[PDB]
Design a binder for this molecule. Structure first.
Ligand SMILES: [Ca+2]
Ligand SMILES: [Ca+2]
Ligand SMILES: [Ca+2]
Ligand code: NA
Length: 276
């Protein structure tokens, strides 16, 4: 694991021996790519570089096979051949055949590690909101009052915590009646004494959540969990369920989950205990 280095042909800068087969495994750290460039190339020329050749293998494909005698036509650089790969590993192989008629001096080449911009180079952004690239990695950041989930990728608001124990109460989505936040998971816990069940009361007009997709699946969802029984998911304009919902349990979890896009008014419900 290195940041740079050189690769010289056997007996460089003098003639390379015949019947040789040397290999180099290049490895830079993760989050880095590799820039490989040749500053010297003096190898026996042949069709498809059959006899003598230097070979470059990156990842799973062959990047190049080099032979012949070529110099730098640009006076401002000694580079005659270069390669740029987005992988942290690279392979160089040099083969010389049985005999060398002329004076061939082989090759000199150098490699340096290059940073990957995970924020732009990747096909799909690794952050829900903002991506911050640095050298050897990247990190995700969130807008004000948003917080980074345990995956260090998704941002959401803090809309959990309070446990409800009162025999009657009122619960509403964040920022009600202004639009609710995105990419968040809100959790409300209602805990009544054993003799009572939790009854939820939701007015039809007090409920506006993003509509479900064409398949009928809710992207943002409101769900009531009572032990084994589940109520919902609920979606759409207007509460789909009944006005009075008997959960038949003294313990209820209300989980409102949102995705990254599409926010509407939200909801407001009331709960009350009922003797059993
Ligand atoms: Ca040879
Ligand atoms: Ca990076
Ligand atoms: Ca949404
Ligand atoms: Na050489």
């Amino acid at each position: 694991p290195t940041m740079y280095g050189e690769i010289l042909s056997p007996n460089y800068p003098q003639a390379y021996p015949s019947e040789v087969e040397k290999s180099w495994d290049i490895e830079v750290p993760e989050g880095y790519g590799i820039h490989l460039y040749f500053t010297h190339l003096d190898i026996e020329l042949s069709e498809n570089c059959a006899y003598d050749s230097v070979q470059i293998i990156s990842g799973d494909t062959e990047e190049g096979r080099l032979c012949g005698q070529r110099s730098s036509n640009n006076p401002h650089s000694p580079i005659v051949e270069e390669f740029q790969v987005p992988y942290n590993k690279l392979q160089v192989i040099f083969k010389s055949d049985f005999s060398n008629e002329e004076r061939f001096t082989g090759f000199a080449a150098y490699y340096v590690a290059t940073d990957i911009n995970e924020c732009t180079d990747f096909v799909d952004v690794p952050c829900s909101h903002f991506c911050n690239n640095f050298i050897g990695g990247y990190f995700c950041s969130c807008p004000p009052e948003y917080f980074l989930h345990d995956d260090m990728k998704n941002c959401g608001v803090n809309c959990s915590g309070d446990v409800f124990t009162a025999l009657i109460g009122e619960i509403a989505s964040p920022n009600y009646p202004k639009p609710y936040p995105e990419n968040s998971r809100c959790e409300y816990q209602i805990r009544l004494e054993k003799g009572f069940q939790v009854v939820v009361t939701l007015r039809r007009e007090d409920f506006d959540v993003e509509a479900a997709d064409s398949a009928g699946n809710c992207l943002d969802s409101l769900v009531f969990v009572a032990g084994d029984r589940q109520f919902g998911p609920y979606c759409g304009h207007g509460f789909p369920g009944p006005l009075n919902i008997e959960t038949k349990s003294n313990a209820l979890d209300i989980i409102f989950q949102t995705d990254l896009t599409g926010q509407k008014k939200g909801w407001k419900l009331r709960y009350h205990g009922d003797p059993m």
